[PDB]
Design a protein around this ligand. Structure first.
Ligand SMILES: [Zn+2]
Lengths: 150, 155, 87, 144, 129, 81
RNA sequence: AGGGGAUCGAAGAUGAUCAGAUACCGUCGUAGUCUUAACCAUAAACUAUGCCGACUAGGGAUCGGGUGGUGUUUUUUUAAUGACCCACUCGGCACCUUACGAGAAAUCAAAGUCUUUGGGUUCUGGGGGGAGUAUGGUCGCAAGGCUGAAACUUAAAGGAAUUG
RNA sequence: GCGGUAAUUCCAGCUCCAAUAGCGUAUAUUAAAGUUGUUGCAGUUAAAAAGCUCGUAGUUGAACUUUGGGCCCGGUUGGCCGGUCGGAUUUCCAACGGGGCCUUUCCUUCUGGCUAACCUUGAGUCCUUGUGGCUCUUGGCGAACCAGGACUUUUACUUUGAAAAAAUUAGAGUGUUCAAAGCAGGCGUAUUGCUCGAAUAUAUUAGCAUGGAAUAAUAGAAUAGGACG
RNA sequence: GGAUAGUGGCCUACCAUGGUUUCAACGGGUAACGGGGAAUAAGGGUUCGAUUCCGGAGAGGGAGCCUGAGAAACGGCUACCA
């Protein structure tokens, strides 16, 4: 696949057959759920949080030791932010790129890339809006995204 | 659609031959008539409770449901007491042995008993020529509001 | 290939490769018939008695006649190790 | 699967495309535009009569070397002019100018026949009688 | 993107056959795939297949012999109106006397013969001979 | 080749292929209980860091990440699983 | 429309050459060539070969990332590192040999799995010439771009290979 | 493609061929044409991949949710016998279908009408040592659809059926003397009738009706504003 | 409300701003009446139907109308154009 290029690299997570376990793992649900939530107070992303936990701590996958995905925990304790993580970071990027282009319009490369990024933003937002996780009138425009990120 | 004022016409809106005597002190003010379409069509509470008039009402008006009974997706509710619905289908073409997405927009009356919105799948019943284009009458709202409130705010 | 009331009809029921079971036909002058001999007690090897195999020109060409030989004539008991089903 | 949409609901695109590419079929185009009527000395009819203007002697193409006897003809139905060959040996002896002849096609849909340039028609009858019967001896060319 | 997993399976099997192989690793398993392979083995074209279970969509190891000339899929599962099955078997089968057109009906995934006997019909899946 | 065991692959040429090209795919990264003798307590670490992990109490270090695994900070010990 | 204008250098003038030589060769040299702000939108813009997906065959290199080694080499004190070596794995730019298979052939790991004819999808072509012409529409300051006929004519035009 | 002095193509004689009460021609159309390509084309060099990437309408779109076992009921061919005075039905038996079952298993649901079917049994038995067999009312099966009240996520596909003019087509019957046709006709007591017909099939798309539950869509309980009581 | 045998923007009055469209509206072309059908035989198709049956429309072009159960009739009338 790989949309906005013709790159065809394979790179991911080989998820274990072990839907349960980690056998050698102690603690409880309580432990890691508190972890998640307090890190959410600190203000980290479920990607950030999961990476951190899987590193310094000993959590193979948060959903296994706790039958629930991270963002679901966040939303459950009222920690879900305005818009999702991927859409957020897309808009943030498009924002930085756009500032770069405001700084020199001579860079057509940045134009092309800005088009791509924003197209991804629009397609994604269309998906999100379809599944009701975004108000069915939600649209991205630059002049408002500047604020919307910050 | 309708709503408000009820008596908002130059003429007096009244159900024909439904005399309510002044001398006979009633506690309902106005005497209401109604029936049932048939075919399984429950006459909604808002029709017998309500105080609208609509002579083009299937449940309180002077029309009759008979002939075709169709369903469709509401595409237009911009007019008054009448809507347009898109009925989609697929057409078989032999030479290619395949189908093609077609559609027709049917004009259809809608009583002030119902409360329609663009998207509500609806069931209509063919009546007599009501207007220049209208031969159907909304007879049941199968949908709801497409989970509208399910797009609410933050927290 | 019989007919109405039994009776074999139509001549010639061709061979068949042992490794692939794909028919061996006449113009394939690239097929092969390998004859291994039914040896007996101490040294000697009974002539007039064979374990025979067919090998389609296909496989011969593809270069798998050797390997398929090993496989075929070991679980046919005249080889011990050499070839293994896993890899 | 090379271009063509194989889906189960892509009838529309398929027949549309079929029309589109039908237009590259020469006789489809011509049958649909109306050419048979629009152009063409005959009106799309099989035959057409017309009066003889002058008698022509058309030198044949290469590598042949002769003179092809013809006539210039003005078609009655539609006043269009057109030159027509006169078949067989003689027969240009049978016409005379101002005569009222009967023309048919050359069996090539337009397209001049052999070595005769720009002649897409021929003579079949003159003066009311068949040119053939004249060339034999069965019949004789009427009064005037 | 993977458009028809059945199509992939059949292509896989055929491509294994031709090359002179005796097994196939096909991927990833499905219900239609399984029932198809089953109607195949019911007439002894393949040996026995095994559903290996990756904790995702599946894997299948199909042991095959060599009776199989060609199995395949009809891309747009057309609708067969019971008078049309004859037309299809005529279309892509070597002879009257053998081979099987196989289709999905509201009486299950079955071959044109079983469909004919049962007197049921529907969409056309593929074919085997 | 021509005929082989797809259901049963040798541990050798199964341990060569890609993490997704195995028979039934699975990870190739391990957890290890790691310890620096400064304190007395051990902390579980994932072999590929991303995050530069420190010990329980003493703000020391444990590993600085790389293009893959985590380079353990010299004066440390570890145990798989 | 400004700057810039070393160089080479459509135009143009010249010396030659030739029957002629508006050329090829020599000299002079305007515009150009550079850059800024706007245009313009085409190249044999080519791999003359649409994109996503699956499968079908062997070999040695090389780019990038990773892993494995009581390999070499760097010495300081053994390491750490850095370069190199070897095996393996992803994703690359390419070659090699093959050919089960394809082709009209030249050739092609796709141009294969295609009369045993169906993974999904976008685009174009239907004898040659007339002709990318005419007409309309639209785009541009212009040069011109896109969209784009017919009448008539014609038995061939064309591709790959073989011998001469 | 023939003809420029020996023309196997012209003008003719002879001889011969082909079709034959008919044969040529001109125009169109269909087949040939896989040269319009759904079936089924072609696009490196022959006609043809847009300079490039985005991208809306359109076409298309991974996998996974009742699978597996047990029992009954009655059909339709066919086999080996025939029991019989060409065809017949039991059981012996396989084969191939349908219906209903119990396996945690809505079948819309109450409120009675209806009950055909048995867990029933009430006496026993014609009769093969009896679960072979069904007439037979008194505790005990719902769905088979009645009518009334109360509600139901929507589809595509497929089956069977109804509703369906004739002529036309496919096609049965009848010797217009044959035949294209026609729907006649055929038989005796041919002096006071007798009688077979005037079939069947297709008739698709859409609408109605009915069975199916694979394939493929659609809707649902996450700010629980959820499910039944 | 009027008008009709009667439903209806059929017409009038008041009032609103709606109705169709790349699933191709609207417009143009047709040497276009529609159907039962016909020609062509592997199949899928292609082509055609003015014409013995059914439905519609017209009576040189247009309008208007009398009579009547039924006609906007034309082998009826009235007016205009040819
Ligand atoms: Zn420490």
């Amino acid at each position: 696949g790989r949309m906005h290029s013709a790159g065809k690299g394979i790179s991911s997570s080989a998820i274990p057959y072990s839907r349960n376990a980690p056998a050698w793992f102690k603690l409880s649900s309580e432990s890691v759920i508190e972890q998640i939530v307090k890190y959410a107070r600190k203000g980290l992303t479920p990607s950030q949080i999961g990476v951190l936990l899987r590193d310094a701590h000993g959590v193979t996958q948060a959903r296994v030791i706790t039958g629930n995905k991270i963002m679901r925990i966040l939303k459950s304790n009222g920690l879900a932010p305005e818009i999702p993580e991927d859409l957020y970071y897309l808009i943030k990027k498009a924002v930085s790129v756009r500032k770069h282009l405001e700084r020199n319009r001579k860079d057509k490369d940045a134009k092309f890339r800005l088009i791509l990024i924003e197209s991804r933003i629009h397609r994604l937002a269309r998906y999100y809006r379809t599944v009701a996780v975004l108000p069915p009138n939600w649209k991205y425009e630059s002049a408002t995204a500047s604020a919307l990120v910050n | 659609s309708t709503e408000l004022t009820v008596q908002s016409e130059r003429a007096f809106q009244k159900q024909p031959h439904i005399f309510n005597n002044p001398k006979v002190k009633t506690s309902k003010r106005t005497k209401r008539w109604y029936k049932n379409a048939g075919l399984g069509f429950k006459t909604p509470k808002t029709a017998i409770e309500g105080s609208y008039i609509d002579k083009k009402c299937p449940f309180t008006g002077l029309v009759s449901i008979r002939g075709k009974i169709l369903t469709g997706t509401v595409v237009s509710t911009k007019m008054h007491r009448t809507i347009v619905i898109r009925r989609a289908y697929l057409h078989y073409i032999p030479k290619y042995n395949r189908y093609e997405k077609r559609h027709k927009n049917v004009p259809v009356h809608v009583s002030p008993a119902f409360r329609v919105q663009v998207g509500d799948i609806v069931t209509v019943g063919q009546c007599r020529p009501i207007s220049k284009t209208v031969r159907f009458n909304v007879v049941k709202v199968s949908a709801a509001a497409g989970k509208a409130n399910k797009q609410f705010a933050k927290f | 290939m019989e007919n109405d009331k039994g009776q074999l009809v139509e001549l010639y029921v061709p061979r068949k490769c042992s490794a692939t079971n794909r028919i061996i036909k006449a113009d394939d002058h690239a097929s092969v018939q390998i004859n291994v001999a039914k040896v007996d007690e101490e040294g000697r090897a009974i002539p007039g008695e064979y374990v025979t195999y067919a090998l389609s020109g296909y496989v011969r060409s593809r270069g798998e006649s050797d390997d398929s030989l090993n496989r075929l004539a070991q679980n046919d008991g005249l080889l011990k190790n050499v070839w293994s089903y896993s890899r | 699967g090379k271009g063509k949409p194989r889906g189960l609901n892509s009838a529309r695109k398929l027949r549309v495309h079929r029309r589109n590419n039908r237009w590259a079929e020469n006789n489809y185009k011509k049958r649909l535009l109306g050419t048979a009527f629009k152009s063409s000395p005959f009106g799309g009819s099989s035959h057409a009569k017309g009066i003889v203007l002058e008698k022509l002697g058309i030198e044949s193409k290469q590598p042949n070397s002769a003179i092809r006897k013809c006539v210039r003809v003005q078609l009655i139905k539609n006043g269009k002019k057109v030159t027509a060959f006169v078949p067989n040996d003689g027969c240009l002896n049978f016409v005379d100018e101002n005569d009222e002849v009967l023309l048919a096609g050359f069996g090539r849909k337009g397209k001049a026949k052999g070595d005769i340039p720009g002649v897409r028609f021929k003579v079949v009858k003159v003066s009311g009688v068949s040119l053939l019967a004249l060339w034999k001896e069965k019949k004789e060319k009427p009064r005037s | 993107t993977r458009s028809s997993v059945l199509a992939d399976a059949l292509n896989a099997i055929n491509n294994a056959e031709k090359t002179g192989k005796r097994q196939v690793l096909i991927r990833p398993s499905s219900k239609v795939i399984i029932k198809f392979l089953q109607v195949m083995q019911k007439h002894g074209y393949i040996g026995e297949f095994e559903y290996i279970d990756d904790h995702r969509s599946g894997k299948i190891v199909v042991q095959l012999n060599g009776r199989l000339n060609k199995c395949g899929v009809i891309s747009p599962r057309f609708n067969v109106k019971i008078g049309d099955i004859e037309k299809w078997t005529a279309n892509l089968l070597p002879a009257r006397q053998f081979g099987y057109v196989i289709l999905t009906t509201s009486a299950g995934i079955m071959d044109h013969e079983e469909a004919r006997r049962k007197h049921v019909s529907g969409k056309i899946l593929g074919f085997v001979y | 080749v021509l005929v082989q065991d797809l259901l049963h692959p040798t541990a050798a040429s199964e341990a060569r292929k890609h993490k997704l090209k195995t028979l039934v795919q699975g990870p190739r990264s391990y957890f290890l209980d790691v310890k620096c003798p400064g304190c007395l307590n051990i902390t579980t670490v994932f072999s590929h860091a991303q995050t530069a992990v420190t010990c329980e109490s003493c703000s020391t270090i444990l590993c600085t990440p790389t293009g893959g695994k985590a380079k353990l900070s010299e004066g440390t010990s570890f145990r798989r699983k």
